[PDB]
């Protein structure tokens, strides 16, 4: 395998779904996992319970590269944002730095209207 052993983590967080992606510092992807692969298929994906499952599945996939140095970067609000951290701590990975990399727009485009119902 690659045996780079320095793959960082990209835990994308959303209200509807949970996206997990682990890649090297350069950005060439190694492995990824989401709630949809596990078979939830609906609002159950929005629940935080599938987030740690997808994260630990991505960790099992990363076991092939034998990587154990992590940098966690999260984007977006919603439940399941922190469950991936507990997952990657339970599997036994070492994490170098922990921070939020959510993007804030500086006077971006006009957002959509508010939902009345």
């Amino acid at each position: 395998t690659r045996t780079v052993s320095e793959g960082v983590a990209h835990i994308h967080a959303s209200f509807n779904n949970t996206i997990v992606t682990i890649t090297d510092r350069q950005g060439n992807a190694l492995a990824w996992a989401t709630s949809g692969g596990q078979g939830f298929r609906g609002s159950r994906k929005s629940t935080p319970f599938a987030a740690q499952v997808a994260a630990e599945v991505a960790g099992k996939a990363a076991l092939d590269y034998g990587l154990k140095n992590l940098d966690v970067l999260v984007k977006g609000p919603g439940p399941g944002r922190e469950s991936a951290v507990r997952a990657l701590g339970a599997v036994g990975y070492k994490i170098n730095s922990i921070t939020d990399v959510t993007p804030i727009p500086h006077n971006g485009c006009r957002p959509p209207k508010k939902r009345r119902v």
Partner: peptide, 21 residues
């Protein structure tokens, strides 16, 4: 996130009035 074109004036003023007391 959403659009509020001028209603932040209302919300800021009322939150201020609450914070005064």
């Amino acid at each position: 996130k959403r659009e509020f074109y001028e209603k932040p004036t209302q919300e800021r003023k009322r939150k201020k009035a609450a914070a005064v007391k």
